[PDB]
Amino acid sequence: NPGTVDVLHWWTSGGEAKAVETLKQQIQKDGFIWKDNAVAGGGGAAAMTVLKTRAISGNPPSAAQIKGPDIQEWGALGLLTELDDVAAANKWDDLLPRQVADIMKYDGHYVAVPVNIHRVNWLWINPQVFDKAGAKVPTTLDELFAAADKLKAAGFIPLAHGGQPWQDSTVFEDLVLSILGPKGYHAAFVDLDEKTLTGPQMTEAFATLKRLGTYMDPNRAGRDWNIAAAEVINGKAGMQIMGDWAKSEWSAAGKVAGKDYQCVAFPGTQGSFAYNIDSLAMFKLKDANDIKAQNDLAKVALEPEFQTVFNQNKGSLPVRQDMDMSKFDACTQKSAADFKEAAKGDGLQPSMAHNMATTLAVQGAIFDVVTNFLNDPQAEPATAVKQLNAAIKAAR
């Protein structure tokens, strides 16, 4: 046995699978065995359940898709391996933005390797559906509702949305970023500031979320994010509020920007970039050949060729800084420009819904408040903000 790579991840949709296939291929070309542990469940909760079993099993995966502050917990447990030598040889501190490199370190040592930078705060449009409905691509919340009114009148699903908590909170966080702005967003989700969490603007975010719910399919419970994307691709819906992993579904269907889809910053979030960094935390392994395979995985993750093909298929930006951005599609080039702009000011903000801003316990509290609210058409925004602050406090 040359050594086996076992990555625990949740890349299972048609688009996500095309991306992870590029990793499988490179590992095989490098002469190692690929043994997949893909665990289906958008946003990763199902994967995390499997991980919690496997991690203290004595047979951990080579790596697992573990993001944000949660990397600190796995590092604190002593389960991850330090990557000093591979990081030095492959110049990771030079290749990675400082903001990103810090997330990957436990007590100053790399313990995880990033593969991308997803943008969460996108809105996906089907321009052909917009043309049929006489609708205008929205740049403001008011325009978003105007477009939704027209799509509805035209007999389309205005907003294709799946009723799962992480999806609900993806929409909610877009609203918070839009209404509060990036500094307010940071105060609420990173600093967990009580006055922000319970303020009039957060209250208005909940009122806006409730209205948005009136423009979704009432029987959307359980609908996977790729199902929602398909409604837009197939011309049944006008819009989807989702990160740029949605682009992977458009690309996998052979669709092109302008003609088939557009993406625009979520209305009112122009200038802000809510980032989601997929990273592979590397577990301490026992088997010598599997350690060699793991070291190969760590090398591959930031190789220029892999950074290109993975991210072309995945819908995200590459995380490596020296890349020829002209090799990506127009939407990814827009993402790059928007990242650069955001990074100059205070616009670059970690996604709460995608595990970058908070611990998982705090995220879970927020998810519960937001679905409970959106599940109840009669719910009150003033109560929601009190529950939001209270539940966050109890989760810590």
Do residues 40 and 331 make contact, with C-beta atoms less than 8 angstroms apart?
A: no
Stretch that binds ligand BGC, among 37-45, 53-61, 200-208, 321-329 (CB under 6 A): 37-45
Closest separation between CB of residue 170 and ligand BGC, Å? 9
Closest separation between CB of residue 378 and ligand BGC, Å? 31
What part of residues 114-143 is at the interface with ligand BGC (CB under 6 A)? 118
Closest separation between CB of residue 173 and ligand BGC, Å? 12
What part of residues 305-364 is at the interface with ligand BGC (CB under 6 A)? 354
Instruction: Kindly state whether residue 44 participates in binding ligand BGC, applying the rule CB under 6 A.
Output: yes
Q: Is 10 annotated as a binding residue?
A: yes
Closest separation between CB of residue 33 and ligand BGC, Å? 24
**Strand pairing category for 279-282 and 112-114:** antiparallel
Q: Is 225 annotated as a binding residue?
A: no
Give 245 or 367: the residue with its C-beta nearer to ligand BGC. Answer: 245
Closest separation between CB of residue 10 and ligand BGC, Å? 5
Do residues 351 and 120 make contact, with C-beta atoms less than 8 angstroms apart?
A: yes
Closest separation between CB of residue 43 and ligand BGC, Å? 5
Give 42 or 181: the residue with its C-beta nearer to ligand BGC. Answer: 42
Instruction: Kindly state whether residue 16 participates in binding ligand BGC, applying the rule CB under 6 A.
Output: yes
Distance CA 160, CA 142 (A): 18
Backbone φ/ψ region at 226: left (φ over 0), alpha (ψ -120 to 50), beta: alpha
| Full DSSP string of 364-380 | HHHHHHHHHHHH-TT--
Instruction: Kindly state whether residue 10 participates in binding ligand BGC, applying the rule CB under 6 A.
Output: yes
Instruction: Tell which one of 43, 114, 163, 238 touches ligand BGC (CB under 6 A).
Output: 43
Number of residues that bind ligand BGC (CB under 6 A): 11
Q: Is 43 annotated as a binding residue?
A: yes
Closest separation between CB of residue 332 and ligand BGC, Å? 15
Backbone φ/ψ region at 180: left (φ over 0), alpha (ψ -120 to 50), beta: alpha
Instruction: Tell which one of 70, 231, 278, 290 touches ligand BGC (CB under 6 A).
Output: 278
Cα 32 from chain centroid (whole Å): 29
Give 64 or 141: the residue with its C-beta nearer to ligand BGC. Answer: 64
Q: Is 73 annotated as a binding residue?
A: no
- Which runs of E-coded beta strand occur in 63-144? 63-65, 105-106, 109-110, 112-114, 118-119, 122-125
Nearest C-alpha neighbor of 167 from the set 55, 62, 245, 69: 245
Length of the chain: 396
Stretch that binds ligand BGC, among 24-32, 36-44, 367-375, 383-391 (CB under 6 A): 36-44
Distance CA 29, CA 245 (A): 26
Instruction: Tell which one of 32, 145, 206, 245 touches ligand BGC (CB under 6 A).
Output: 245
Give 43 or 60: the residue with its C-beta nearer to ligand BGC. Answer: 43
- Nearest residue to ligand BGC, by Cβ distance, number only: 245
Closest separation between CB of residue 117 and ligand BGC, Å? 10
Between CA 362 and CA 289, with CA 320 as vertex, the angle to 5 degrees is 85
Distance CA 149, CA 7 (A): 44
- Which runs of E-coded beta strand occur in 151-297? 157-159, 237-241, 262-265, 273-276, 279-282
Alpha-carbon Rg for the chain, nearest whole angstrom, is 21
Instruction: Kindly state whether residue 42 participates in binding ligand BGC, applying the rule CB under 6 A.
Output: yes
281, 286, 288, 294: CA torsion to nearest 10: -10
Do residues 112 and 135 make contact, with C-beta atoms less than 8 angstroms apart?
A: no
Instruction: Kindly state whether residue 276 participates in binding ligand BGC, applying the rule CB under 6 A.
Output: yes
Q: Residues annotated in the binding site, as ranges? A: 10-11, 16, 43, 67, 276, 278, 314
Q: Residues annotated in the binding site for beta-D-galactose, as ranges? A: 10-11, 16, 43, 67, 276, 278, 314
Under the rule (CB under 6 A), what is the footprint of ligand BGC? Answer: 10, 16, 42-44, 118, 225, 245, 276, 278, 354
